[PDB]
Amino acid sequence: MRSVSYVQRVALEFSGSLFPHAICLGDVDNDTLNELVVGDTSGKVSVYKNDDSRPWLTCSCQGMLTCVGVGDVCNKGKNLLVAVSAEGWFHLFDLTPEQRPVFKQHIPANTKVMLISDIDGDGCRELVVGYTDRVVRAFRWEELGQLVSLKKWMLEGQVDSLSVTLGPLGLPELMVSQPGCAYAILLCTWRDVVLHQTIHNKNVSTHLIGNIKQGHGTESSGSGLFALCTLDGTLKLMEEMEEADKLLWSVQVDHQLFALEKLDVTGNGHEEVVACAWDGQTYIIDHNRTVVRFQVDENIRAFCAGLYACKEGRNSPCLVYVTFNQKIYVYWEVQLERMESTNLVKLLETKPEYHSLLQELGVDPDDLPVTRALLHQTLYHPD
Amino acid sequence: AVAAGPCPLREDSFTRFSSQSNVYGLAGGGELLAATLKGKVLGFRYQDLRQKIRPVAKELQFNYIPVDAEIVSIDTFNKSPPKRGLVVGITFIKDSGDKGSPFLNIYCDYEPGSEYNLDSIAQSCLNLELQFTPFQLCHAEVQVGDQLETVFLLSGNDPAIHLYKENEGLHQFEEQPVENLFPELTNLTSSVLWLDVHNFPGTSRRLSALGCQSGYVRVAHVDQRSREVLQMWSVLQDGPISRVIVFSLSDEYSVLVASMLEPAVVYRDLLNRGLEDQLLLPGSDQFDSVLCSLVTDVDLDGRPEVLVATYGQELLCYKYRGPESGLPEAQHGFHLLWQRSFSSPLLAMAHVDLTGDGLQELAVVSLKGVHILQHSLIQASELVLTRLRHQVEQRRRRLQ
Amino acid sequence: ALPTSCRPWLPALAWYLRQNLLIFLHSFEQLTQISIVQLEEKLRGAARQALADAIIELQLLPASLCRQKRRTTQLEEGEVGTLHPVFARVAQRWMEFMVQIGCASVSRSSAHMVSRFLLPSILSEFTALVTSMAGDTSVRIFEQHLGSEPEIFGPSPRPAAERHLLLLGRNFLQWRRPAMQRFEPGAPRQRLLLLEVVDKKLQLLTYNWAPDLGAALGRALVRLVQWQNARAHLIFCLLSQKLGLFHHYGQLDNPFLLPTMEVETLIRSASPPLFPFDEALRDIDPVTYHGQQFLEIKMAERRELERQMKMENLFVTWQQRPISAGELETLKQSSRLVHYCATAMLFDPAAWWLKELSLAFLQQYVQYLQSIGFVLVPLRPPTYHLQRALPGGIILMELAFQGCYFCVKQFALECLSMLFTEECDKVRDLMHVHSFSYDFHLRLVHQHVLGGYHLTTFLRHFLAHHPDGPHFGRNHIYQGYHMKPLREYALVSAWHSSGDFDVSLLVCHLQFFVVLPRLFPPLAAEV
């Protein structure tokens, strides 16, 4: 409903092409401080740390990275860097105290996306990949170690993103975007692919995110909310609940949305949905349909929102844009005191002791001019 | 050169402009007016919705400006309390020929009940040719007979100031000689970039200051009823005078001079020492040129501070460490309180209760648009609380 | 009549006369108290000037400007100490007094400096100028100590202050010795440079300089201040329009103040050189700091406009039907990757000679792409690229080989928004790389049937890799004495059944295989 103009930002030089899925942020050196991982098609992955313009480090794969990620895929309690190319290769990196990987294994080609999570509930983290031809494949790590294939699913509509959220039974799920503002639920890496629809062109590209926080300290185990975005410019937030989904809110914009992330800018535990368009019009919506629009006056190749360690060694919420002039912009003061717009008269009304503190003063807070005169006297004429 | 704390200002809204504005673009109204160079005028305000507020920026169309005319300056004021009315003045240039024709339009709806209606005022123009390039439309209030009269003042390309007084009988604004009412405003060499006329409340004296493109700054203590120059002082600085403001640090008057190539300075003890006690604000020339400036209370302490807006996108605030907390070796000084940053060069500001709470918002017009800044609501909410509880406790202790 | 004060100056005045006499005649006041009617007046002025010149030389300026040797140099060189009382008040007003009395050993000048930024930006230039015409002088800036009343000169803080200065230069090296100098011992023939500065008012007092060279120095100073004032067009149309005042202080409102004013040279090195400016910063020392950003602003748009026309000329050229490699790189950088597809190259054993098959595979797909309306992009004269220009934008394709896979990438560049996306996505549905690979493999399999590859192993590999079979292909394969051998041994044959579908049978040890893009009952009937 209101716009802002964030100011402080870090510009990082970055030359090369990339897919909207080859950028992420996470801890690779295992120090509770997030770095930025960017994977380009020329055969190089760059990790950015702190706020230096140059990359912190480079990783040399063999060809055409298509997805990158970080997580505990080897189930050793540590964090590792995973990179998948186009011909179905798979590279592992241990960046904890050039840069050839530590593990190589071939998988089916035509890779498009990535996800690392415990999908079943066995306590071991599995890897899920989506392909250009409506095929999804699950894997697991097994000590020898090696990647062992698992259930594999066929779909009809194009797959764009995979996510894991809590199901109605309190168990992890696996959801995949399906064109036409639809999505498919996969079933267990022990009829086979359930489909749901949420009217526009049936070939409209669609992206999905899931596992949205709802409180503080619930990050250990909790989900239930997921968001959908379409290229024609519609966004939706829904809740799994029990039988079918509940539509929490829907918004129609007039831009070409191509990304979907979650952040925490207010800092009150809840996570806000962050969307970006091709022309740079960023939307930030809380769970109460309080939109805040930012507009970087550029054209966007890729978008990424999350925690990042920029200055003074401390993780802060950040927005990340990739531009056509070989520049990555990191906006990091993006914390907001609030989402809506308000004033002192309304904010001071919420607190309860105000009406006692002013009734003891004889002034009945029924006349706004008297209240504002008293407040101006209190603030600007203390004596 | 180090901030003594955090900036308590949080951005509320931001309305983007298609084209840029100028330092005379900003004007009063609790509404705000911002005119673009290409004839675009926007009226900023806020609206209430239950337990929330919403910024509103609506476009206004003014009558007699052709589609090729370029707006140069705008000002506004209200008629003196004996009468009623809102007066707006726009000076533009009709680009007919290599050098355009300057024009002055004065909008004032004389019809009763619509003096303050800006929609009706938008088409009530009184076009007037100029024969000079206007620079700044200012307004002043003088004492004639026994009643106050608010008049216009306009710098011109000719090094002179032109007074435009209303004619009571025939309801029209006509030029009149300046030396009749403002004897200190004659015999100038450069064009007055900024002019300030400070009154002394309950006193027929006044303090006039002006700075021109040459750097020449002139201050005159002038009596009104006798229309004589009680005293006059002048200095010759380096750069064009972006701003001069007359303010009291607590007699005991002082001036603030904000140039474009020098740190902003404050001359103290005007009526007793003239222009010799020069306290310069430390490290205020490190952020390009000081375009705007403002003198108001930003810390809610009852004592003023100096706000300086620069072209390097900076919003410095300076605080006065007076001898009331005496440190004679350092007492009575200005130190950098805090500092903010922006995305575009800042061209103007106001200090106005846009929202309607009693707290003063700081509207900042920059190259790309208008930012509205509020005080940190959490910070202010508890400060009012503690001050109110202190007052209640001290009144219970006293009144018993 | 001569004063008795100069009793021992008899030789000295004999060297300042035969010196100041030879100007017209060819070959305070107390101490200096054929047209014959004016000849005496002419001859008296020469002696008076001689006495004055000797006074300065022998009684005013032999003084010092300001472990024992260390203080005997910093005092001599004026680096450490304080300026002598001579160069405080008497020297200036006496050298200037050498004007009313006719004397060709003293010059003068002036300047304006419409503002006083440029004093630092004039002093360095004057130092370089003096050193160029004469490296003998050494510039020392003896500013008056703030608040001090008189001679206090300690070798712009507090603005609106009429800063004093006594920029001085002297032949320090040629002490114990008083074509460069105009005069010589006819006596302390030493020269001196004094440049008094009073607020915004310059004043030169070059003394004993060469006449032509000294006048040149004064004129160069005049021109230098002229050029510095001309470098008030920051004041004119950078500072003024920084407030948004483009119409108020225009250009030309000085020899360097002409309608043809080279802005670039005067927002550069502060000197006289030996898009409209009036809206430059519209809707986008302090001289080289204020115009320097203007230069960057004016270059960042020239480069952008250089790129913008390159973006459009190719669009219009290709929309009707050997672009440089850098042009291709820029085109790819300005465009977004949208889709891609890759497929296996099974004939290579390693992915279980071959290059020629890959090139053959490369060509037959190129011909397919052209048949749906794609134009080959020729490589410029110092990996295949195809284009299809549309009103919505440009769609580009790339073909290349990495390892053992064939990859196709589809770029897009916008220029009714969905009128390009739908065009972009529709091409993706027509790539048909899988079906093309299917058909190419089956066709190449029929190039040994008709005449050391283990065809049985390759057939098993192909059957395992694509058990289903793409729906857009046309060829078909089925598993289960007019024969022909195959070096194990395999039997092959070929009958051209047209129930039209060329078919063949291959059998090896008894396993047999039958070998039979578009936008089977014959596969099984052949028994």
mmCIF file with all atom_site columns, C-alpha atoms in Angstrom, chain B residues 93-247:
data_model
loop_
_atom_site.group_PDB
_atom_site.id
_atom_site.type_symbol
_atom_site.label_atom_id
_atom_site.label_alt_id
_atom_site.label_comp_id
_atom_site.label_asym_id
_atom_site.label_entity_id
_atom_site.label_seq_id
_atom_site.pdbx_PDB_ins_code
_atom_site.Cartn_x
_atom_site.Cartn_y
_atom_site.Cartn_z
_atom_site.occupancy
_atom_site.B_iso_or_equiv
_atom_site.pdbx_formal_charge
_atom_site.auth_seq_id
_atom_site.auth_comp_id
_atom_site.auth_asym_id
_atom_site.auth_atom_id
_atom_site.pdbx_PDB_model_num
ATOM 1   C CA . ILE B 1 93  ? 8.769   31.061 -18.505 1.00 0.00 ? 93  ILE B CA 1
ATOM 2   C CA . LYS B 1 94  ? 6.902   30.748 -21.799 1.00 0.00 ? 94  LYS B CA 1
ATOM 3   C CA . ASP B 1 95  ? 9.476   29.374 -24.243 1.00 0.00 ? 95  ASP B CA 1
ATOM 4   C CA . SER B 1 96  ? 8.637   31.655 -27.163 1.00 0.00 ? 96  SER B CA 1
ATOM 5   C CA . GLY B 1 97  ? 11.895  32.493 -28.920 1.00 0.00 ? 97  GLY B CA 1
ATOM 6   C CA . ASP B 1 98  ? 15.494  31.826 -27.986 1.00 0.00 ? 98  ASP B CA 1
ATOM 7   C CA . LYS B 1 99  ? 14.930  33.605 -24.665 1.00 0.00 ? 99  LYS B CA 1
ATOM 8   C CA . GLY B 1 100 ? 11.532  32.935 -23.163 1.00 0.00 ? 100 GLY B CA 1
ATOM 9   C CA . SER B 1 101 ? 9.051   35.407 -21.775 1.00 0.00 ? 101 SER B CA 1
ATOM 10  C CA . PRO B 1 102 ? 8.922   35.356 -17.960 1.00 0.00 ? 102 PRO B CA 1
ATOM 11  C CA . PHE B 1 103 ? 5.506   35.485 -16.362 1.00 0.00 ? 103 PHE B CA 1
ATOM 12  C CA . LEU B 1 104 ? 3.994   35.806 -12.906 1.00 0.00 ? 104 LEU B CA 1
ATOM 13  C CA . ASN B 1 105 ? 0.687   34.212 -11.961 1.00 0.00 ? 105 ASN B CA 1
ATOM 14  C CA . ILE B 1 106 ? -1.016  34.949 -8.651  1.00 0.00 ? 106 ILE B CA 1
ATOM 15  C CA . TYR B 1 107 ? -3.902  32.652 -7.769  1.00 0.00 ? 107 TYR B CA 1
ATOM 16  C CA . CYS B 1 108 ? -6.331  33.809 -5.088  1.00 0.00 ? 108 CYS B CA 1
ATOM 17  C CA . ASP B 1 109 ? -10.035 32.976 -5.201  1.00 0.00 ? 109 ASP B CA 1
ATOM 18  C CA . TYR B 1 110 ? -11.763 36.088 -3.870  1.00 0.00 ? 110 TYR B CA 1
ATOM 19  C CA . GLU B 1 111 ? -15.196 34.443 -3.835  1.00 0.00 ? 111 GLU B CA 1
ATOM 20  C CA . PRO B 1 112 ? -16.406 33.921 -0.247  1.00 0.00 ? 112 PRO B CA 1
ATOM 21  C CA . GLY B 1 113 ? -16.217 30.400 1.118   1.00 0.00 ? 113 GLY B CA 1
ATOM 22  C CA . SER B 1 114 ? -13.628 29.303 -1.460  1.00 0.00 ? 114 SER B CA 1
ATOM 23  C CA . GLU B 1 115 ? -10.545 31.254 -0.381  1.00 0.00 ? 115 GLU B CA 1
ATOM 24  C CA . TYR B 1 116 ? -8.829  28.063 0.807   1.00 0.00 ? 116 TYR B CA 1
ATOM 25  C CA . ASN B 1 117 ? -10.201 25.743 -1.900  1.00 0.00 ? 117 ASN B CA 1
ATOM 26  C CA . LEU B 1 118 ? -7.149  24.830 -3.961  1.00 0.00 ? 118 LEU B CA 1
ATOM 27  C CA . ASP B 1 119 ? -9.305  23.382 -6.752  1.00 0.00 ? 119 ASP B CA 1
ATOM 28  C CA . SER B 1 120 ? -11.043 26.714 -7.362  1.00 0.00 ? 120 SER B CA 1
ATOM 29  C CA . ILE B 1 121 ? -7.756  28.570 -6.826  1.00 0.00 ? 121 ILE B CA 1
ATOM 30  C CA . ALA B 1 122 ? -6.221  26.426 -9.571  1.00 0.00 ? 122 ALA B CA 1
ATOM 31  C CA . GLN B 1 123 ? -8.154  28.551 -12.098 1.00 0.00 ? 123 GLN B CA 1
ATOM 32  C CA . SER B 1 124 ? -8.391  32.104 -10.774 1.00 0.00 ? 124 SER B CA 1
ATOM 33  C CA . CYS B 1 125 ? -5.164  33.389 -12.273 1.00 0.00 ? 125 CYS B CA 1
ATOM 34  C CA . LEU B 1 126 ? -4.059  36.986 -12.747 1.00 0.00 ? 126 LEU B CA 1
ATOM 35  C CA . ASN B 1 127 ? -1.362  36.837 -15.408 1.00 0.00 ? 127 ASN B CA 1
ATOM 36  C CA . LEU B 1 128 ? 1.342   39.498 -15.210 1.00 0.00 ? 128 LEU B CA 1
ATOM 37  C CA . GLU B 1 129 ? 4.356   40.097 -17.420 1.00 0.00 ? 129 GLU B CA 1
ATOM 38  C CA . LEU B 1 130 ? 7.671   40.603 -15.680 1.00 0.00 ? 130 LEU B CA 1
ATOM 39  C CA . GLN B 1 131 ? 10.452  42.120 -17.851 1.00 0.00 ? 131 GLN B CA 1
ATOM 40  C CA . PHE B 1 132 ? 12.941  40.246 -15.636 1.00 0.00 ? 132 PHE B CA 1
ATOM 41  C CA . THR B 1 133 ? 13.807  36.663 -14.801 1.00 0.00 ? 133 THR B CA 1
ATOM 42  C CA . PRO B 1 134 ? 12.279  35.799 -11.405 1.00 0.00 ? 134 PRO B CA 1
ATOM 43  C CA . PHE B 1 135 ? 14.491  34.036 -8.877  1.00 0.00 ? 135 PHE B CA 1
ATOM 44  C CA . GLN B 1 136 ? 12.667  33.436 -5.583  1.00 0.00 ? 136 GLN B CA 1
ATOM 45  C CA . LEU B 1 137 ? 9.111   34.170 -4.561  1.00 0.00 ? 137 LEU B CA 1
ATOM 46  C CA . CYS B 1 138 ? 9.155   35.019 -0.857  1.00 0.00 ? 138 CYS B CA 1
ATOM 47  C CA . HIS B 1 139 ? 6.555   36.647 1.349   1.00 0.00 ? 139 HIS B CA 1
ATOM 48  C CA . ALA B 1 140 ? 6.789   39.087 4.231   1.00 0.00 ? 140 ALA B CA 1
ATOM 49  C CA . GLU B 1 141 ? 4.471   40.707 6.749   1.00 0.00 ? 141 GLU B CA 1
ATOM 50  C CA . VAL B 1 142 ? 4.747   44.431 7.437   1.00 0.00 ? 142 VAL B CA 1
ATOM 51  C CA . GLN B 1 143 ? 2.975   46.769 9.833   1.00 0.00 ? 143 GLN B CA 1
ATOM 52  C CA . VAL B 1 144 ? 1.087   49.571 8.093   1.00 0.00 ? 144 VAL B CA 1
ATOM 53  C CA . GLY B 1 145 ? -1.188  51.952 9.944   1.00 0.00 ? 145 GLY B CA 1
ATOM 54  C CA . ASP B 1 146 ? -2.367  49.749 12.795  1.00 0.00 ? 146 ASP B CA 1
ATOM 55  C CA . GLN B 1 147 ? -2.880  46.462 10.920  1.00 0.00 ? 147 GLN B CA 1
ATOM 56  C CA . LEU B 1 148 ? -0.646  43.788 9.444   1.00 0.00 ? 148 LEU B CA 1
ATOM 57  C CA . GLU B 1 149 ? -0.258  43.353 5.688   1.00 0.00 ? 149 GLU B CA 1
ATOM 58  C CA . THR B 1 150 ? 1.271   40.326 3.972   1.00 0.00 ? 150 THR B CA 1
ATOM 59  C CA . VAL B 1 151 ? 3.027   41.138 0.702   1.00 0.00 ? 151 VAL B CA 1
ATOM 60  C CA . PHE B 1 152 ? 4.993   39.279 -1.956  1.00 0.00 ? 152 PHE B CA 1
ATOM 61  C CA . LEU B 1 153 ? 8.675   39.747 -2.740  1.00 0.00 ? 153 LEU B CA 1
ATOM 62  C CA . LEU B 1 154 ? 10.439  38.581 -5.887  1.00 0.00 ? 154 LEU B CA 1
ATOM 63  C CA . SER B 1 155 ? 14.102  38.612 -6.757  1.00 0.00 ? 155 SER B CA 1
ATOM 64  C CA . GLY B 1 156 ? 14.706  39.588 -10.352 1.00 0.00 ? 156 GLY B CA 1
ATOM 65  C CA . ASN B 1 157 ? 17.411  39.240 -12.978 1.00 0.00 ? 157 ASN B CA 1
ATOM 66  C CA . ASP B 1 158 ? 17.858  42.958 -12.517 1.00 0.00 ? 158 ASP B CA 1
ATOM 67  C CA . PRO B 1 159 ? 19.599  43.155 -9.137  1.00 0.00 ? 159 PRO B CA 1
ATOM 68  C CA . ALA B 1 160 ? 16.452  44.334 -7.377  1.00 0.00 ? 160 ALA B CA 1
ATOM 69  C CA . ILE B 1 161 ? 13.546  43.079 -5.282  1.00 0.00 ? 161 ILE B CA 1
ATOM 70  C CA . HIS B 1 162 ? 10.033  43.754 -6.563  1.00 0.00 ? 162 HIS B CA 1
ATOM 71  C CA . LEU B 1 163 ? 7.143   44.151 -4.141  1.00 0.00 ? 163 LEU B CA 1
ATOM 72  C CA . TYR B 1 164 ? 3.674   43.132 -5.325  1.00 0.00 ? 164 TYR B CA 1
ATOM 73  C CA . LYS B 1 165 ? 1.000   44.533 -3.034  1.00 0.00 ? 165 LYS B CA 1
ATOM 74  C CA . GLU B 1 166 ? -2.702  43.819 -3.221  1.00 0.00 ? 166 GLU B CA 1
ATOM 75  C CA . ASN B 1 167 ? -5.000  46.751 -3.980  1.00 0.00 ? 167 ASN B CA 1
ATOM 76  C CA . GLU B 1 168 ? -7.884  46.603 -1.508  1.00 0.00 ? 168 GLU B CA 1
ATOM 77  C CA . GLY B 1 169 ? -10.310 48.564 -3.677  1.00 0.00 ? 169 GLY B CA 1
ATOM 78  C CA . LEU B 1 170 ? -9.984  46.730 -6.992  1.00 0.00 ? 170 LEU B CA 1
ATOM 79  C CA . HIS B 1 171 ? -8.772  43.278 -5.838  1.00 0.00 ? 171 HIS B CA 1
ATOM 80  C CA . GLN B 1 172 ? -5.590  42.841 -7.845  1.00 0.00 ? 172 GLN B CA 1
ATOM 81  C CA . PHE B 1 173 ? -1.891  42.435 -7.114  1.00 0.00 ? 173 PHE B CA 1
ATOM 82  C CA . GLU B 1 174 ? 0.214   45.259 -8.538  1.00 0.00 ? 174 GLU B CA 1
ATOM 83  C CA . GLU B 1 175 ? 3.899   46.073 -8.327  1.00 0.00 ? 175 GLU B CA 1
ATOM 84  C CA . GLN B 1 176 ? 4.871   48.929 -6.019  1.00 0.00 ? 176 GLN B CA 1
ATOM 85  C CA . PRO B 1 177 ? 8.243   50.500 -5.182  1.00 0.00 ? 177 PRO B CA 1
ATOM 86  C CA . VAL B 1 178 ? 10.311  48.493 -2.723  1.00 0.00 ? 178 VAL B CA 1
ATOM 87  C CA . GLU B 1 179 ? 12.135  51.305 -0.907  1.00 0.00 ? 179 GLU B CA 1
ATOM 88  C CA . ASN B 1 180 ? 8.845   52.588 0.528   1.00 0.00 ? 180 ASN B CA 1
ATOM 89  C CA . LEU B 1 181 ? 8.450   49.651 2.923   1.00 0.00 ? 181 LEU B CA 1
ATOM 90  C CA . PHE B 1 182 ? 11.857  47.909 2.851   1.00 0.00 ? 182 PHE B CA 1
ATOM 91  C CA . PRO B 1 183 ? 14.549  50.611 2.880   1.00 0.00 ? 183 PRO B CA 1
ATOM 92  C CA . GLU B 1 184 ? 17.224  48.007 3.643   1.00 0.00 ? 184 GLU B CA 1
ATOM 93  C CA . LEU B 1 185 ? 16.400  46.104 0.420   1.00 0.00 ? 185 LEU B CA 1
ATOM 94  C CA . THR B 1 186 ? 17.860  48.598 -2.067  1.00 0.00 ? 186 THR B CA 1
ATOM 95  C CA . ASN B 1 187 ? 21.158  49.148 -3.885  1.00 0.00 ? 187 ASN B CA 1
ATOM 96  C CA . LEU B 1 188 ? 22.062  45.540 -4.647  1.00 0.00 ? 188 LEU B CA 1
ATOM 97  C CA . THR B 1 189 ? 24.721  44.220 -7.015  1.00 0.00 ? 189 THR B CA 1
ATOM 98  C CA . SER B 1 190 ? 23.883  40.503 -7.297  1.00 0.00 ? 190 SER B CA 1
ATOM 99  C CA . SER B 1 191 ? 20.679  38.479 -7.468  1.00 0.00 ? 191 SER B CA 1
ATOM 100 C CA . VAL B 1 192 ? 19.194  37.542 -4.100  1.00 0.00 ? 192 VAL B CA 1
ATOM 101 C CA . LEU B 1 193 ? 19.242  33.741 -4.024  1.00 0.00 ? 193 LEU B CA 1
ATOM 102 C CA . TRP B 1 194 ? 17.679  33.615 -0.561  1.00 0.00 ? 194 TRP B CA 1
ATOM 103 C CA . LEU B 1 195 ? 16.142  36.331 1.594   1.00 0.00 ? 195 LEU B CA 1
ATOM 104 C CA . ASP B 1 196 ? 14.915  36.075 5.190   1.00 0.00 ? 196 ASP B CA 1
ATOM 105 C CA . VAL B 1 197 ? 12.876  38.646 7.109   1.00 0.00 ? 197 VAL B CA 1
ATOM 106 C CA . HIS B 1 198 ? 12.553  37.812 10.804  1.00 0.00 ? 198 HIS B CA 1
ATOM 107 C CA . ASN B 1 199 ? 10.125  39.724 12.976  1.00 0.00 ? 199 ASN B CA 1
ATOM 108 C CA . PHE B 1 200 ? 10.461  40.393 16.688  1.00 0.00 ? 200 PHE B CA 1
ATOM 109 C CA . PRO B 1 201 ? 7.100   39.466 18.248  1.00 0.00 ? 201 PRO B CA 1
ATOM 110 C CA . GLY B 1 202 ? 5.555   42.291 20.235  1.00 0.00 ? 202 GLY B CA 1
ATOM 111 C CA . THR B 1 203 ? 8.095   44.728 18.792  1.00 0.00 ? 203 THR B CA 1
ATOM 112 C CA . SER B 1 204 ? 8.096   47.088 15.810  1.00 0.00 ? 204 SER B CA 1
ATOM 113 C CA . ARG B 1 205 ? 11.668  46.061 14.978  1.00 0.00 ? 205 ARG B CA 1
ATOM 114 C CA . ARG B 1 206 ? 12.795  43.414 12.524  1.00 0.00 ? 206 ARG B CA 1
ATOM 115 C CA . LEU B 1 207 ? 15.962  41.685 11.372  1.00 0.00 ? 207 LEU B CA 1
ATOM 116 C CA . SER B 1 208 ? 16.477  41.289 7.635   1.00 0.00 ? 208 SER B CA 1
ATOM 117 C CA . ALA B 1 209 ? 19.110  39.044 6.093   1.00 0.00 ? 209 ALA B CA 1
ATOM 118 C CA . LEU B 1 210 ? 19.950  38.278 2.509   1.00 0.00 ? 210 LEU B CA 1
ATOM 119 C CA . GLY B 1 211 ? 22.573  36.385 0.582   1.00 0.00 ? 211 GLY B CA 1
ATOM 120 C CA . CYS B 1 212 ? 23.173  36.693 -3.132  1.00 0.00 ? 212 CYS B CA 1
ATOM 121 C CA . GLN B 1 213 ? 25.074  34.781 -5.791  1.00 0.00 ? 213 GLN B CA 1
ATOM 122 C CA . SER B 1 214 ? 28.175  36.864 -5.049  1.00 0.00 ? 214 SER B CA 1
ATOM 123 C CA . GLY B 1 215 ? 28.406  35.572 -1.478  1.00 0.00 ? 215 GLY B CA 1
ATOM 124 C CA . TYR B 1 216 ? 27.525  38.983 -0.041  1.00 0.00 ? 216 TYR B CA 1
ATOM 125 C CA . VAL B 1 217 ? 25.489  38.571 3.156   1.00 0.00 ? 217 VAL B CA 1
ATOM 126 C CA . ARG B 1 218 ? 23.704  41.590 4.596   1.00 0.00 ? 218 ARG B CA 1
ATOM 127 C CA . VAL B 1 219 ? 21.795  41.828 7.882   1.00 0.00 ? 219 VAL B CA 1
ATOM 128 C CA . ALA B 1 220 ? 19.947  44.953 8.987   1.00 0.00 ? 220 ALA B CA 1
ATOM 129 C CA . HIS B 1 221 ? 18.151  45.779 12.225  1.00 0.00 ? 221 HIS B CA 1
ATOM 130 C CA . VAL B 1 222 ? 15.274  47.956 11.043  1.00 0.00 ? 222 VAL B CA 1
ATOM 131 C CA . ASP B 1 223 ? 12.452  49.691 12.881  1.00 0.00 ? 223 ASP B CA 1
ATOM 132 C CA . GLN B 1 224 ? 9.083   49.527 11.160  1.00 0.00 ? 224 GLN B CA 1
ATOM 133 C CA . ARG B 1 225 ? 6.991   52.426 12.469  1.00 0.00 ? 225 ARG B CA 1
ATOM 134 C CA . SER B 1 226 ? 9.771   54.952 11.961  1.00 0.00 ? 226 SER B CA 1
ATOM 135 C CA . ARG B 1 227 ? 10.870  53.025 8.835   1.00 0.00 ? 227 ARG B CA 1
ATOM 136 C CA . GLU B 1 228 ? 14.526  53.661 9.670   1.00 0.00 ? 228 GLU B CA 1
ATOM 137 C CA . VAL B 1 229 ? 17.606  51.450 9.597   1.00 0.00 ? 229 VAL B CA 1
ATOM 138 C CA . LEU B 1 230 ? 18.648  51.131 13.231  1.00 0.00 ? 230 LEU B CA 1
ATOM 139 C CA . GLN B 1 231 ? 21.811  49.265 12.228  1.00 0.00 ? 231 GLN B CA 1
ATOM 140 C CA . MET B 1 232 ? 23.397  47.426 9.318   1.00 0.00 ? 232 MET B CA 1
ATOM 141 C CA . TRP B 1 233 ? 26.141  44.803 9.060   1.00 0.00 ? 233 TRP B CA 1
ATOM 142 C CA . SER B 1 234 ? 27.549  43.027 6.027   1.00 0.00 ? 234 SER B CA 1
ATOM 143 C CA . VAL B 1 235 ? 30.097  40.329 5.207   1.00 0.00 ? 235 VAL B CA 1
ATOM 144 C CA . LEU B 1 236 ? 31.499  38.933 1.967   1.00 0.00 ? 236 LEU B CA 1
ATOM 145 C CA . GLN B 1 237 ? 31.875  35.151 1.906   1.00 0.00 ? 237 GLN B CA 1
ATOM 146 C CA . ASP B 1 238 ? 33.008  32.870 -0.913  1.00 0.00 ? 238 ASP B CA 1
ATOM 147 C CA . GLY B 1 239 ? 30.148  31.007 -2.541  1.00 0.00 ? 239 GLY B CA 1
ATOM 148 C CA . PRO B 1 240 ? 26.504  31.592 -3.402  1.00 0.00 ? 240 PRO B CA 1
ATOM 149 C CA . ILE B 1 241 ? 24.369  31.799 -0.284  1.00 0.00 ? 241 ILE B CA 1
ATOM 150 C CA . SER B 1 242 ? 22.020  28.836 -0.450  1.00 0.00 ? 242 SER B CA 1
ATOM 151 C CA . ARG B 1 243 ? 20.409  29.775 2.836   1.00 0.00 ? 243 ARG B CA 1
ATOM 152 C CA . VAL B 1 244 ? 20.280  32.303 5.668   1.00 0.00 ? 244 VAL B CA 1
ATOM 153 C CA . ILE B 1 245 ? 18.130  31.832 8.774   1.00 0.00 ? 245 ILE B CA 1
ATOM 154 C CA . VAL B 1 246 ? 17.662  34.099 11.795  1.00 0.00 ? 246 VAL B CA 1
ATOM 155 C CA . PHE B 1 247 ? 17.299  32.181 15.058  1.00 0.00 ? 247 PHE B CA 1
#
